[PDB]
DNA sequence: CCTGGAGACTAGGGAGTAATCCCCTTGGCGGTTAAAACGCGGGGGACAGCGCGTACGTGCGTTTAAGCGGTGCTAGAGCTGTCTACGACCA
DNA sequence: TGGTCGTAGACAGCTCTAGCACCGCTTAAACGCACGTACGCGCTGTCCCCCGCGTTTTAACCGCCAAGGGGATTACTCCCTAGTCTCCAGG
């Protein structure tokens, strides 16, 4: 269960992000407890990605993550990234980042410190992490949504979300 | 692998394209080429690659679109049609993903299939834009268009695109 | 959907074999129409695999497939395998395989004929084919069983396995 | 072929196949992750430092012990050389082959003991495929590592 | 005015081709048996239907923290010349 | 075990630029609180279609058995391609 994965001490994703994500996935409205499983999921995914990123880091002995690092991390997991560094209708057209940005730099710094490598990070890697994490989470929510329809129910539930994740 | 000029050249459907979209489609095509050539490497049992191998590798692709593609390949090889992408850059990216021997006929076939998929992607984008009127093809015109067609998504899908 | 995949005029898997497969999945009971979706699913997987194997055979300027062709196709599906040719609860320990051998050979011959290739098949290629197909079908059936339990129900219906297929793959 | 010496022809074939598959996959991962022209044992060492649990810690500790010391190293270096050279057009060194031999023999030991435990749970003194199937399914981390395959 | 590319050859090494004998498949025939298919209460899971409170959709105020730069800065990511040191290929 | 041979990835030194940290401001969203209700839960009372059982055809399978056919093997030829070359015309 993802319930044990979330802990106390690290930074908190605001709930409004959760309802916005559910609206993006097409759901009607969120339940009173759905925040914890989704926050755990996003935290664990970012943990895995940043860990593989540090794996790439240790190879070149550098101390800043470049777009090459994040793209290698994405591809070794077999994810074809296409981004480049260079009431549902109310947000269907909108494709901006739905999460505040400073929160994830704070998360990245904290997880890197927890691993034990205070390392500077560039914005392009942040954008790549943004897109990959949003894609994964919207996929998972869509899976849960079709499951909860399949149960002849018009609502989402923590049981639904965790069984959807397990179904992978 | 910067094919943007050839994209505009092979795109007669004006509708001035966002600079980002050229990079997106460039990544799209280069990923297609990489996956399909790793495919060709894993399927072959002989040291020298052959054009007919690529033909068959595209033949199993579901739908009459594969037969259209191979018809275009025959046309460009000998029938009536020419190519616009450079052969040399394609050969370089070819060598970057194998340790075998490759003839020019395979290069011609690969350029033809790149022509073909570029044509379908640009026309699908323009059709989706016309469904949404206005102009100036945007990123949104790719997603829910690749998702619009059943076969494209059924064979490409997966790949993460800007937002969702 | 999946039911449309099957058509009148071709051989079919025995119904009792389907029932044994569902029991091997651990399901205590099933609806009366469960045979059709799994028949379609196994036919579709066999069709794709045999087409890919035929392509591999054609590449080598060959006239009859070997275990090498099948293993190359298997690596092609990004699906590893470690095989080399060289009441209900008291049943999972059984390793004996379900679908009869000659039925599967007849299926292969028909699906090759529809491709216009009277190509002989070696028994090692068979072994690989039925083992991989039973693996995929049992995995799908287990996922279906899980999603049925999640529905706060105790049996399985055709809509259930349809949903299971919809989740695992993409559209159509 | 030497797994029997480490310790049922079919089970030996299965263990050899799964070992060579793991070696091939790890070599592919190492080749694709590195950016410099040649690879060192440190690359595989870091590849070890991602397996959650104390088992990965023992894996890397034993790799380090083999590098500093000798342990056993009964595996043919030429066979390993053939295995990665068949699927790599890059540059290698002997430290890497020693490390990969150590890690593969460690995995062989783990799977052997898991099979023995599973067989003893079923009251059987022989090696059979159903026992290794039950063992590989039972362990969580091995199932996560080997779930992609089938046998 | 560059530069990469349009010819040139040129040999070898793989690519294409022919023969062959036997192993491995392939088709067929037969015996029968294990299995596959056809009824049967029933009863138990499913489902139509009734009832609710409570979890939650929507609305309102408020803050406080997130974004947009603004700026000084530094550190540390690249760029560019050694060398010795560690594989490779040989005895 | 040793020769050498090579080339190449650490190494050091420079540099300039891009993250970084803080400042500050401002204002827009997160959240907490009220209210009123839609629905998932919960229960109920009947229902009909799998599910064990039983009996009763049949054709999968195995074993043999002949047979043949093309496949792994060997031997032969050749021409196609990388692969160096080269200098030179188009860009």
Numbering used by the authors:
A (entry chain D): 15 to 100, 131 to 212
B (entry chain B): 5 to 168
C (entry chain C): 15 to 100, 131 to 216
D (entry chain A): 9 to 15, 22 to 165
Quote the study on this structure:
To investigate whether the putative histone variant MV-varH2B-H2A can form viral NLPs with MV-H4-H3, we used our standard procedure to assemble nucleosomes with a 147 bp DNA fragment (Widom 601 positioning sequence). We were able to determine the structure of MV-varNLP to an overall resolution of 4.4 Å, with higher resolution observed for the protein core, while parts of the DNA and the tail regions are less well defined. MV-varNLP contains the requisite two copies of MV-H4-H3 and MV-varH2B-H2A (although one copy is better resolved than the other), and binds DNA in the canonical superhelical configuration typical for all nucleosomes. However, only about 90 bp of DNA are represented by density in MV-varNLP, compared to 124 bp in the MV-NLP density, and 147 bp in most canonical eukaryotic nucleosome structures. The H2B region of the variant histone doublet provides the requisite configuration for a stable four-helix bundle interface with the H4 portion of MV-H4-H3, and strong contacts with the DNA are established at this site (SHL ± 3.5). The MV-varH2B α3 helix is one turn shorter than in other H2B-like structures, and the adjacent αC helix, which defines the surface of the nucleosome, is two turns shorter than in any other H2B known to date. The connector between H2B and H2A is much shorter in the variant histone and fails to form the “knuckle domain” that in MV-H2B-H2A contact DNA at SHL 4.5. Due to its absence in MV-varH2B-H2A, no contacts with DNA are established at SHL 4.5, even though this region maintains an overall positively charged surface. Interestingly, a conserved cysteine in the MV-varH2A L1 loop forms a disulfide bond with the second varH2A, supported by well-defined electron density, seemingly stapling together the two MV-varH2B-H2A variant moieties. MV-varNLP (with a melting temperature of 49.5 ± 0.55 °C) is destabilized compared to MV-NLP (52.8 ± 0.4 °C), and this difference, although relatively modest, is statistically significant.
